[PDB]
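Teaching assistant here, posting this on the class forum so everyone can see the example we discussed in section. The complex has ten components, and the goal was to see what a joint structure prediction looks like when all of them are supplied at once.
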Amino acid sequence: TGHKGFSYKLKLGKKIHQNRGVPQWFRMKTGNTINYNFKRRHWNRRKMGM
Amino acid sequence: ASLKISAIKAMSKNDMNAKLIELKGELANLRTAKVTGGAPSKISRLRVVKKDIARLLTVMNTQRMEALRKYYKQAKYVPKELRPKTTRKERRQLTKAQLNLKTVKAAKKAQHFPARKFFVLA
Amino acid sequence: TKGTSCRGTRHNKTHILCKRCGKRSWHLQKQRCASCGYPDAKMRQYAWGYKALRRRTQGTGRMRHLKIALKR
Amino acid sequence: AVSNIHFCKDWRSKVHTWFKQPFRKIRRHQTRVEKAKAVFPATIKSLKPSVHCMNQRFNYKLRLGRGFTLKELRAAKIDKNLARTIGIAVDP
Amino acid sequence: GRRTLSQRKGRGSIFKSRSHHKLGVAQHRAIDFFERHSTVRGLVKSIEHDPGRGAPLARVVFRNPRQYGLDKELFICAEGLYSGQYIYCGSKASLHIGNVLP
RNA sequence: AGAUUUGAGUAUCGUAAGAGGACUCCCUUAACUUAAGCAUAUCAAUAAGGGAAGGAAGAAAAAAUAACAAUGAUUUCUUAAGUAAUGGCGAAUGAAAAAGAAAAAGACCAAGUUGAUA
RNA sequence: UGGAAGUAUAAAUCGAAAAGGUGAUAGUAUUCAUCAAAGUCUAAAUAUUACAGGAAAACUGAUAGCAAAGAAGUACUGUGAA
RNA sequence: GAUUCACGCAGUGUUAACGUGCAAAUUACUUGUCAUAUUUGAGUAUAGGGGCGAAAGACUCAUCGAACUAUCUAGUAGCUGG
RNA sequence: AAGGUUCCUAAACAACAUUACUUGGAUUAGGGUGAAUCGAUCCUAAAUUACAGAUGGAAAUCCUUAAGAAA
RNA sequence: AAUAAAAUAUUACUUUGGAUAGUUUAGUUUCCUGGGCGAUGAAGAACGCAAUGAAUUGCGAUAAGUGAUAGGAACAAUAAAAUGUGAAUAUCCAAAAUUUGAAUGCUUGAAAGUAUACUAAGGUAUAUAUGAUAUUCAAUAUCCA
């Protein structure tokens, strides 16, 4: 909604912050298997239930 | 991290906060330099100064608390932060002196009929 | 109209996040958490919920202060 | 033969396995040894009487009892208070 | 079988009284000395409609005999009472319509 | 006015709570199942629900066995023993003394006595 | 409860003592035997599939072995318990 | 708690369309209705041998002649398949 | 209400929108939400929950000013 | 009667798929030693902190880490700086330890908050039950001038 509580907005901001990918430099480390963030979601693909 | 403990330890109580105020002000301009596209050498200086503040604060707090412990060494009522490290269970257990208390009747018997040392010939 | 049509009016929350367990199980009208058993002091645990016990219990978190004590 | 097996209750949680048996021997023996080291005649297993067994089925066999009666200590001229401290069991 | 509607009525969930716009409790004033050995005079300020009951209710206003102030009552209207009427309650009250007597 | 009794507020120094519950001590009158149906019985101190603790807990020093050429606190193991007994005497349930070992240890209150009483 | 004319607990009523309990077939009597209830503590021998730290194996070898050999009670589902 | 039209609503008929659909109940025309026993939002109350029902065993999250979920539970099968 | 960055800009089109896409509510990276006067905060409505009390083997239930040296 | 496009059959090579074989920083079971939490604020939850991080890991406004004691030359994906005047690394140690949570001044929904006292801001204390001591009281409850 337009109106939201203070704590609820910060938990909304963190969900925005965690919807990012692996930085390129992290992918060039030796013996690295993490290429994509499998905890990714999109607004029109999955609702985050909060 | 370039501050050196010996340099800190030689400083006075006021010189701690005089350095601390200057150290915080130095880092405030370094956060700005990181935002405004400063040189990588300034970013490395930013990482260092964060440790001097941590290093400086550790000395002031340890010296303050150590002096506090000496103040309350003979005190009857010691603040809980200065009491010996024990678990919650330990502070409830009866002391070994109280665990070994004997009534006067049993105390005198254990001194009049003690467990003798002996052996049996075969 | 018990199927697709009746789902359009679902825009009112029943549960929201709970302060003690962080899950969306706080019932707004019952004023209690379906998962962690809020204001009730004891945590809500049941023997038939053995999987529920292995999901949130001791050792499932950081153990910020107990990790030093038992190591000590 | 008419079978009589009381397995209709939950016997699986009633099963006791003796896998600790070979390790009980080591544990008890090490404590018996440690007792003699501490104070040697403490494990001396204080002297006990020679009492008969009960019933006519067993009464002709002697076996160790528990402690001498206070009449047996007087007959042997032993103080009952000193008896317990020199490895003599007493059963008033 | 199920529970009959008569059983469900004793729970009082949707069968609670719809008493939100009701005026109050219609009753005499509490018994005291002035109602037992004298008379108190009340003034019928207004006659009003109490929802859920057929009789009108009168807002009678007695003076406080022991303290300074008023004492607002809520009587059930006797047929004939009018606004601005004086009614007397007590052991010595006259036998007129609207007066409260032992 | 004074001597007490009882009940409160406040201050100081502490104590309980919550986590865990594999093992330990208890509360509660489940049912599926078996009986070739089923209604007592069985499943069964079993499930779920509830309370309390410790590194172990519980028990513990005879108002106990026995009928002997007698024993002797408690606990645990072997045996007694699928025995005595219980049961629509059906299905089924079911001990303990003796005897053999591990370990061993006994002490206090109350009541009674002493009162230039403490 | 194995305890069978009541083995144990509890509730209603009743309720002792110049003592008395028990000897499992109810009852009265006389002997015999053995204990002496209605308060408290007590190490040792015993248990353990929480959890932590180790060691072993005629155990499994990625559809197996824990649900999980990778950011596994994670991704994902449900209003929610799950 | 008169007759009708309209914004809306329902669901009489076509037993039309569709019937691996636009849709796990929808579409088109036709019909009925379209403010006082009216329509409707949010808050709040009522819970499983229970609730709620102008009463159809109807409704209680696509679940109802007894919801969903987990445990007892690998319930039992003289029956069926391997 | 619900959604939660879907808003705007630039680069870019492998996948996705039953053909295609230079387009995008899609990919990547930055930017964006300014209150003494608008609202929440304040008040009470249906209703809801505490200390003490009452009840219950238990978990817990009842009571909301009645039972209280309380409010 | 006729052809071999299709159809069928075998082998080699490629393809789709991931069986089989080799392998294990993962499990299972038994046994041994402990069984060491919390009002001195636990377990759990949330948020935040790395030069470039989204998860995870470690940590708490001193932040992927501080002091001290051991330790002796590294780290690395890419740069920087510091470094034998002591880098990595380890610790039953010291300092520090955000919002919550039994959560405990009061309120709490996703709620933003807030009163008093002590020592403008900041920090402490104030829940309920409860033992002991001190102190202020209440009741003609028992006596009593």
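For the discussion questions: Chain D touches chain B at residues 39-42, 44, 81-82, 84-87 (CB under 8 Å). The CA atoms of residues 69 and 91 of chain D lie 6 Å apart. Think about how each of these relates to the inputs above.
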